[PDB]
Paper text:
The high neutralization breadth of the HIV bnAb 10E8 makes elicitation of 10E8-class bnAbs desirable; however, the recessed epitope within gp41 makes envelope trimers poor priming immunogens and requires that 10E8-class bnAbs possess a long heavy chain complementarity determining region 3 (HCDR3) with a specific binding motif. We developed germline-targeting epitope scaffolds with affinity for 10E8-class precursors and engineered nanoparticles for multivalent display. Because the MPER region is sterically occluded at the base of full-length membrane-bound Env and absent from most soluble native-like trimers, epitope scaffold immunogens were previously designed to conformationally stabilize and expose the C-terminal MPER helix. To assess the structural mimicry of the MPER helix within the epitope scaffold and the interaction of the epitope scaffold with the 10E8-class D gene YxFW motif, we determined three crystal structures and one cryoelectron microscopy (cryo-EM) structure of 10E8-GT epitope scaffolds complexed with 10E8-class human antibodies.
Numbering used by the authors:
A (entry chain H): 1 to 52, 52A, 52B, 52C, 53 to 82, 82A, 82B, 82C, ...
B (entry chain C): 1 to 155
C (entry chain L): 3 to 94, 94A, 94B, 94C, 95 to 210
């Protein structure tokens, strides 16, 4: 029931600024301590910062590789958390998650230390700090032939080619069709652009009647493509 | 028949009507009771301590509820089975040190085997007198309010 | 700071013990987090030994001196993920520090041969001055695969971009390989083939422009 949705991930030049937002639902956001964590590509979790509730002073704390460049604010009336990032560097390129912070303390031990942890995490938004330029994707159909079926099932998909930067999400039939859907990780071509594919396995006896549409979402370019995969 | 939310709201009502917590207090306690359980097992008889970290608290007070039929509470510590709670200590602490003092006092009084045996049979007035005497003798508890209407049976 | 072993192996069904080392753990409990390949971290253990919402009872936490150990009894394929510990570092260094993370590998799971689907360039992509062969590999274990492209009957290295294998929903692994060429090269040869080698076995799919 507790849902945290990040937004704002886009391409930003080194030295630029960017404000990430996180919408919270399912809990009283006014009384919850909030935190930003980040994860660089292929590395570990790095705590970015934390902000308290107004009842506890509303104070803010940041990590050393962030002090003086990042700021964390909150709008309790809108149930929204904001992370402003200035003087960005290539090392800041990472996925940023908004987490809620809970506390725990012993009762029988006699000592009453407070141990904070991150129990609810959002899906994260990807910030890429590069001097390159954003490029929207070209979506092409990977239609199933009569020679490449798997008996009762047939794989049909969409190729998302020549886009930058990441990420790109793919759904099928506006999120309705989910049985047998797999979106492959992208590949970094020699031209610096990305390409991925997304397949869905469908009944072979459902190619002439049912219509299949792949929904490609590329936020860093504010682009959404709905490509109708037709049978051949 | 008696759920967790019923217990929380019933124990919070006298604190709301006497002006020591806000209205949303109960609604938050329930929430915390989902994320930070407060079930305790002291020699068979179960104990629950619903409380907040100071939010929606105007003054310090205790609210005691005596369940005639046990109600299941998630344990403060993990266990495959929950805790059948018969005694509930609703805690309204303004600061962290007040909460710590009240928690230590509750830890001290729940180990009292004979007192915990008497709590499940005495009337509201006798429970009030006993708890008032045990509060006055505690130098860390004074400053916490405790009235006759802060004790009730939930059968 | 907190210290973890980078990689740890465990047999399927056995009990594993991933540990976190740090001085601060002498006076503070540690929190443990599970991160499956492409997903977000989830809390599994907090406090002394507490589990949230619906986390399997196979996960247990313990602390002994300056170490903290997450104990997974009865390992399964869905536990093959990254695990991070967290606690309050020393004092005023930061406030919350994460360990380097431990990559858990569950060894003896059912092996599976790869299913290979090879798509030729679409009509729309050929109406533009482009052409891309898409070789999609799915439902194989272990996640080790070698892809080789062939024009007619000769190998092709130029234009090949292959992704590292990645774990999917059912704990199986998937990978993809792309061959970019011009439509004049596509109509030049008689056929193109994607060869996938896995555990010595080779699966090859072929497409032809005469189709």
């Amino acid at each position: 029931e507790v849902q945290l949705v990040e937004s704002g991930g886009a391409l930003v030049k080194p030295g630029g600024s960017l404000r990430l937002s996180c919408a919270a639902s399912g809990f009283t956001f006014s009384n919850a301590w909030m935190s930003w964590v980040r994860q660089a590509p292929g590395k570990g979790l790095e705590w970015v910062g934390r902000i308290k509730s107004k009842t506890d002073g509303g104070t803010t704390d940041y990590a050393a590789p962030v002090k003086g460049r990042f700021t964390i604010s909150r709008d309790d009336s809108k149930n929204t958390l904001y992370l402003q990032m200035n003087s960005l560097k290539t090392e800041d390129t990472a996925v940023y998650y908004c987490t809620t912070v809970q506390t725990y303390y012993d009762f029988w031990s006699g000592y009453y230390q407070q141990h904070y942890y991150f129990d609810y995490w959002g899906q994260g938004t990807l910030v890429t700090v590069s001097s390159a330029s954003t490029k929207g994707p070209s979506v092409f159909p990977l239609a199933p032939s009569s020679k490449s079926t798997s008996g009762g099932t047939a794989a049909l998909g969409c190729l998302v080619k020549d886009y930058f930067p990441e990420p790109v999400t793919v759904s099928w039939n506006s999120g309705a069709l989910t049985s047998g859907v797999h979106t492959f990780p992208a590949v970094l071509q020699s031209s610096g652009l990305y390409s991925l594919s997304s397949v869905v396995t469908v009944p072979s006896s459902s190619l002439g009647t049912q219509t299949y549409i792949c929904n490609v979402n590329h936020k860093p370019s504010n682009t959404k493509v709905d490509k109708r995969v037709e049978p051949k | 028949e008696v759920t967790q939310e019923d217990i929380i709201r019933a124990l919070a009502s006298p604190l709301i009507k006497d002006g020591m917590v806000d209205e949303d207090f109960a609604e938050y306690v329930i929430e915390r009771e989902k994320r930070s359980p407060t079930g305790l097992q002291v020699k068979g008889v179960g104990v629950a301590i619903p409380h907040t970290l100071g939010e929606y608290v105007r003054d310090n007070a205790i609210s005691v509820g005596i369940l005639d039929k046990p109600v299941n509470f998630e344990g403060w510590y993990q266990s495959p089975d929950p805790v059948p709670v018969r005694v509930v200590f609703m805690l309204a602490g303004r600061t962290w040190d007040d909460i710590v003092n009240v928690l230590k006092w509750i830890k001290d009084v729940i180990l009292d085997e004979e007192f915990m045996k008497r709590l499940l049979t005495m009337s509201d007035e006798e429970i009030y007198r006993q708890i008032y005497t045990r509060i006055s003798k505690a130098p860390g508890m004074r400053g916490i309010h405790f009235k006759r209407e802060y004790v009730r049976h939930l059968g | 700071e907190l210290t973890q072993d980078p990689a740890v192996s465990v047999a399927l069904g056995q009990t594993v013990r991933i540990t976190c080392q740090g001085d601060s753990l002498r006076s503070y409990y540690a929190s443990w987090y599970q991160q499956k390949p492409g997903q977000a971290p989830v809390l599994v253990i907090y406090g002394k030994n507490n589990r949230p919402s619906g986390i399997p009872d196979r996960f247990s936490g313990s602390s002994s001196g300056n170490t903290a150990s997450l104990t997974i009894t009865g390992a399964q394929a869905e536990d093959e993920a990254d695990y991070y510990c967290n606690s309050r570092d020393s004092s005023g260094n930061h406030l919350w520090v994460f360990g380097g993370g431990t990559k858990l590998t569950v060894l003896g799971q059912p092996k599976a041969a790869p299913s290979v689907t090879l798509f030729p360039p679409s009509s729309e992509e050929l109406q533009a001055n482009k052409a891309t062969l898409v070789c999609l590999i799915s439902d194989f274990y272990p996640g080790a695969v070698t892809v080789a492209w062939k024009a007619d009957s000769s190998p092709v290295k130029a234009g090949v971009e292959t992704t590292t294998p990645s774990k999917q929903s059912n704990n199986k692994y998937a990978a993809s390989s792309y061959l970019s060429l011009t439509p004049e090269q596509w109509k030049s040869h008689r056929s193109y083939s994607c060869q996938v080698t896995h555990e010595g076995s080779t699966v090859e799919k072929t497409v032809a422009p005469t189709e």
